[PDB]
Short mmCIF file of N, CA and C and ligand atoms in Angstrom, two decimals:
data_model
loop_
_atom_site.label_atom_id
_atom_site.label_comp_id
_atom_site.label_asym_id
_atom_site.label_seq_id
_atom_site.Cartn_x
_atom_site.Cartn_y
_atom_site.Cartn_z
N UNK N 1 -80.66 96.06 166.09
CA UNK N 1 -80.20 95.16 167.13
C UNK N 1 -79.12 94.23 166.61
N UNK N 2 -78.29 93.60 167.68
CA UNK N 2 -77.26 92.95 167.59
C UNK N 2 -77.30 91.65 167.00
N UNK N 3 -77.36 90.68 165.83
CA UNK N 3 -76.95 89.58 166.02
C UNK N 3 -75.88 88.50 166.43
N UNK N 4 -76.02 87.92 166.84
CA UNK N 4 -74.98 86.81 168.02
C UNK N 4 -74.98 85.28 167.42
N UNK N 5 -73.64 84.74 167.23
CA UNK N 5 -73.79 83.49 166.81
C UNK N 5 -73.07 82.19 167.58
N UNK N 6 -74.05 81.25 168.10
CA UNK N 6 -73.25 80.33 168.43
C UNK N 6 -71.99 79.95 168.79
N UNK N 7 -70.95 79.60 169.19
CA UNK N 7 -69.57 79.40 168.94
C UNK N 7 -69.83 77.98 168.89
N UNK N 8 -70.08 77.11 169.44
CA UNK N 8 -69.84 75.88 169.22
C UNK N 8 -70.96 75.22 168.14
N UNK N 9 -71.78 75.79 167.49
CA UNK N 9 -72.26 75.42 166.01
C UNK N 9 -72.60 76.33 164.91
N UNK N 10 -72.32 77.69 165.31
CA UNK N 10 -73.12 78.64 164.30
C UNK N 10 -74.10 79.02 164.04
N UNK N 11 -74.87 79.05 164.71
CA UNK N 11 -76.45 79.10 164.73
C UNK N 11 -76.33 80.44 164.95
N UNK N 12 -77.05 81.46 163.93
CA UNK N 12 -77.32 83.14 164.31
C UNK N 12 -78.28 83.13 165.25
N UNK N 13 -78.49 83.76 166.02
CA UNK N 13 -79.97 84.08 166.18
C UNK N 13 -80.14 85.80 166.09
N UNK N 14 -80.71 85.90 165.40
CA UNK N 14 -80.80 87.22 164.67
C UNK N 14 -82.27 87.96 165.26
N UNK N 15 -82.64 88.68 165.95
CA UNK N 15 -83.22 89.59 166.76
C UNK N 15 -84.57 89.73 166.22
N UNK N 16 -84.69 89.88 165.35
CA UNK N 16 -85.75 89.96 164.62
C UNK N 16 -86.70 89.22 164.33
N UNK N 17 -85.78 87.79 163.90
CA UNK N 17 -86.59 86.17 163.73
C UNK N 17 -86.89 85.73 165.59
N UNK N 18 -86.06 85.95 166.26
CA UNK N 18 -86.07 85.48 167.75
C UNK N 18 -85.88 84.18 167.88
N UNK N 19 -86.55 83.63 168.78
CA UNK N 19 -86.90 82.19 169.08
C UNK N 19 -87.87 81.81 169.22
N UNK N 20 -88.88 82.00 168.76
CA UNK N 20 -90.61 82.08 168.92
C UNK N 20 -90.77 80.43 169.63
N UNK N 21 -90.31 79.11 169.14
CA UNK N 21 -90.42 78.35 169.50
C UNK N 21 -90.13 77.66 170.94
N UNK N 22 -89.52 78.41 171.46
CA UNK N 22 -88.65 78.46 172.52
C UNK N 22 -89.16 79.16 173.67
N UNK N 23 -90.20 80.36 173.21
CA UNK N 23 -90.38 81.72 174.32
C UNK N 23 -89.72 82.82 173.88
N UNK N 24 -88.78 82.76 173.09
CA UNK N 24 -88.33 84.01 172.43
C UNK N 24 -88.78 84.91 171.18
N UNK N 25 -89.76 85.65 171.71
CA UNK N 25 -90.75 86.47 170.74
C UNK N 25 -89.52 87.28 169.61
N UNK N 26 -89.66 87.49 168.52
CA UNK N 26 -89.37 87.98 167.37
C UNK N 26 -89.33 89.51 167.68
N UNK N 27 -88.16 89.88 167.73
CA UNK N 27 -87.88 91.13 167.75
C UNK N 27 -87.34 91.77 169.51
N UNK N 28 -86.97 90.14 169.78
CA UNK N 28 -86.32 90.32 171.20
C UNK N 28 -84.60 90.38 170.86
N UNK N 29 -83.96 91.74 171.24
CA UNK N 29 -82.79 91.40 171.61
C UNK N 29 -82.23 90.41 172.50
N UNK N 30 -81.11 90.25 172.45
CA UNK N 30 -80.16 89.13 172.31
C UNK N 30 -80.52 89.25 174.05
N UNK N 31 -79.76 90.70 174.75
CA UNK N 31 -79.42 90.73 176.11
C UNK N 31 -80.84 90.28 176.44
N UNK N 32 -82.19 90.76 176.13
CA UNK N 32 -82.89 90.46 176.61
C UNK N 32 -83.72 89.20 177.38
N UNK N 33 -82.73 88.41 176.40
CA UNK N 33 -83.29 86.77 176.41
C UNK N 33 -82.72 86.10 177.52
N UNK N 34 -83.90 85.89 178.20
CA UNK N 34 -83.59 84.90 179.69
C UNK N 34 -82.71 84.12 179.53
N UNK N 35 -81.74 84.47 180.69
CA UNK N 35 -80.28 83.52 180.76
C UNK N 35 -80.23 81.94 180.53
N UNK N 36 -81.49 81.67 181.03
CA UNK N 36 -81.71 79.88 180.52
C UNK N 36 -81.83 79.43 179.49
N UNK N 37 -82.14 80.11 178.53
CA UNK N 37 -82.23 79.71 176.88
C UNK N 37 -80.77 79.28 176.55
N UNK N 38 -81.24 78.32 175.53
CA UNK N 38 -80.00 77.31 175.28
C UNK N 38 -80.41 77.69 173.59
N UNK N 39 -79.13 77.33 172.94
CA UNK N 39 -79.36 77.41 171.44
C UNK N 39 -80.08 76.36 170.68
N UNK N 40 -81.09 76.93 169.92
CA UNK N 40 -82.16 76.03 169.39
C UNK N 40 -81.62 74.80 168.66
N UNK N 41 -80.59 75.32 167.91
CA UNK N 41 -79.35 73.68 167.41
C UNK N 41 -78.67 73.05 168.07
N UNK N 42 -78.19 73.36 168.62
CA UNK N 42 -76.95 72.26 169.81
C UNK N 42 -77.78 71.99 170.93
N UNK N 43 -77.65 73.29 171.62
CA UNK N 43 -77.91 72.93 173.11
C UNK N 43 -77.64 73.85 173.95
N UNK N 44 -76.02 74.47 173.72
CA UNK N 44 -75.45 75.24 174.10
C UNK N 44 -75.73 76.53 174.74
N UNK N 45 -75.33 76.98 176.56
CA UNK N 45 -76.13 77.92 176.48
C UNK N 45 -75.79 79.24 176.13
N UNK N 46 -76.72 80.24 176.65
CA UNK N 46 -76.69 81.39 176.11
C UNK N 46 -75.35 82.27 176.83
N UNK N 47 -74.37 81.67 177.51
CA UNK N 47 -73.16 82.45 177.19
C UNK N 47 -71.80 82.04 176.20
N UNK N 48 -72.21 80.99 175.44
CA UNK N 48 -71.54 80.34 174.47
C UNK N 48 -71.61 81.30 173.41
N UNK N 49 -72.76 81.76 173.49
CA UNK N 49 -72.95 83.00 172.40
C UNK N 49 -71.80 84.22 172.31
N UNK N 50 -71.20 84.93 171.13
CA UNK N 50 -70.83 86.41 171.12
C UNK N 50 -71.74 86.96 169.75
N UNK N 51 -71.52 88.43 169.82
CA UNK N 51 -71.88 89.39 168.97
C UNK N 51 -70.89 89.11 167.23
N UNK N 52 -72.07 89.13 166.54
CA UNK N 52 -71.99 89.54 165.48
C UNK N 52 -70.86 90.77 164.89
N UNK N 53 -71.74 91.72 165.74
CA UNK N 53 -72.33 92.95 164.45
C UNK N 53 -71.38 94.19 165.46
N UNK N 54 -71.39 94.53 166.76
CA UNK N 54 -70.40 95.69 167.04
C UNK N 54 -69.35 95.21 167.53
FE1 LIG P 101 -75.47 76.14 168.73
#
C-alpha cells in the first residue's frame, strides 16, 4: 500500500501503522480512510495529503 504525506507538515501516514488513535485501524489504506480524518499533527485535512510511493 501507498504511503501519503502531509503537505503542510510532513506527517507520513504509512498504511500499515494507520491511525489507531483516531479510528484508523493499522493496515488501512490511505483511500480507505474516511474523508473527515484530519492529520494527527497539524490538523490538516485529508485532501492536503498526496502519495508517496506511485
Ligand atoms: Fe500535517
Amino acid at each position: 500500500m501507498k504511503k501519503y504525506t502531509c503537505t503542510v507538515c510532513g506527517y507520513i501516514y504509512n498504511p500499515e501503522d494507520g491511525d489507531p488513535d483516531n479510528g484508523v485501524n493499522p493496515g488501512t489504506d490511505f483511500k480507505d480512510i474516511p474523508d473527515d480524518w484530519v492529520c494527527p499533527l497539524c490538523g490538516a485535512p485529508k485532501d492536503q495529503f498526496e502519495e508517496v510511493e506511485e
